[PDB]
Design an enzyme around this catalytic site. Structure first.
Site, PDB file in Angstrom:
ATOM      1  CG  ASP B  95      -1.918   1.088   1.318  1.00 26.65           C
ATOM      2  OD1 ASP B  95      -1.763   2.117   0.632  1.00 26.65           O
ATOM      3  OD2 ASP B  95      -2.902   0.932   2.072  1.00 26.65           O
ATOM      4  CB  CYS B  98       1.404   0.985   4.190  1.00 21.96           C
ATOM      5  SG  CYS B  98       2.602  -0.269   4.713  1.00 21.96           S
ATOM      6  CB  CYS B 101       4.400  -0.334   2.213  1.00 19.66           C
ATOM      7  SG  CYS B 101       3.030  -1.282   2.972  1.00 19.66           S
ATOM      8  NE  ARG B 125      -2.302   0.547   4.836  1.00 20.25           N
ATOM      9  CZ  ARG B 125      -1.780   1.510   5.586  1.00 20.25           C
ATOM     10  NH1 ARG B 125      -1.477   1.282   6.854  1.00 20.25           N
ATOM     11  NH2 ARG B 125      -1.561   2.705   5.064  1.00 20.25           N
TER      12      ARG B 125
END
Lengths: 216, 216
Positions: B95, B98, B101, B125
């Site tokens: 994502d 994120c 991430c 998400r």
């Protein structure tokens, strides 16, 4: 083969408490501390579930049925406050340290007067080994469960008692059913409805549920 | 047979995408628009997945193993960061909104240097109706997916665009595989390993996973 199934669960650190033949050939319904699982007779394959029987008058959740079987076995451990003329029967997960639970009990005469029979199972929100769990163990093991519960809820002290009742079963079953707070109500059809409701409101709610459940 | 399974799915208003064999006699692996279901040959029972093969050393998600078919069908839609000396190939649901991430992506060259090839699939998400979905839809639709992904992560304005890429499919697959957060790693065997792991740790994890899953 129950033996093969338990060995597999053991290797996984999973503990079972009930195993029954599943509606599906070669499989069994197994209640574990990881929930109800479906395992083949050889213990080589596990399916998460739930399992639904879609061959009958309606879609039936076998997992919910397995859990309701556990509830049935706990009837001998329920504290029952029967209504004079029984119209509804509800099973309530209660905690003696819970404020709304104190209220529900103080209004028991009213629920009973409105035709509602209340059956209690213990659910210590603080978990097992808590003061609450120890206290309810004593109550559930009393010579008269009802009087003992009444006494404690009245602010009195109950005599320590020991018996084969295991509060961990009430707590564990509540958790498996989805209990996330007390008081939590389980309807006669098996539905879980968390929360407190006063006598009049509860009676209305149950009348409606009974009518909705019966299509009337 | 196919007819019984199709009629049962029809009763539920469910459309089957593919009926495949199951490692358990009397049932089939059925991929539907509602996820992967195990349905008995007579169409009388449905069991929600996943199914695990626990006849060996460690449990293996056979459902995810099958879904690898769906995963590989999205191979061209993946954003690939090829390791020069490829020793491991992992698929990561990421994502762009994120933090973990971002931390993983910032060390891409390090994962690649350790022989780990990373292939990304989009996993918003916040669901399909979010900024994350819109931003990754533009990334995956860019002339150069890799550069577009790097830019977005680095805080650069990605040029808007649209295409045959449906982030919804990446999201749907992730959910089915059990993605419960990002980044989530899918191993070459279908095993889902949620969470961020630094290059060194990730490499060690993959190596040990090979040995523990192999037997040498």
């Amino acid at each position: 083969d129950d033996a093969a199934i338990q060995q597999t669960l053991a290797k996984m650190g999973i503990k079972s408490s009930d195993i029954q033949p599943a509606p599906v050939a070669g499989m069994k319904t197994v209640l574990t501390n990881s929930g109800v699982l479906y395992i083949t007779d050889d213990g080589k394959h596990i399916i998460q579930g739930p399992m639904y029987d879609v061959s009958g008058t309606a879609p039936v959740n076998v997992t919910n049925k397995m859990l309701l079987k556990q509830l049935n076995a706990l009837e001998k451990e329920m504290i029952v406050y029967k209504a004079p003329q029984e119209k509804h029967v509800i099973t309530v997960f209660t905690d003696i340290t819970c404020g709304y639970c104190h209220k529900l009990h103080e209004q028991m005469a009213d629920y009973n007067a409105l035709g509602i029979t209340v059956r209690y199972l213990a659910f210590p929100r603080q978990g097992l080994d808590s003061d609450a769990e120890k206290e309810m163990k004593a109550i559930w093991c009393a010579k008269d469960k009802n009087k003992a519960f009444d006494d404690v809820m009245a602010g009195k002290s109950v005599a320590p008692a020991s018996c084969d009742v295991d509060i961990a079963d009430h707590y564990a079953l509540g958790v498996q059913l989805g209990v996330s707070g007390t008081p939590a109500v389980v309807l006669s059809n098996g539905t879980l409805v968390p929360g407190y409701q006063p006598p009049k409101e509860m009676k209305e709610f149950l009348d409606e549920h009974q009518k909705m459940t019966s299509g009337k």
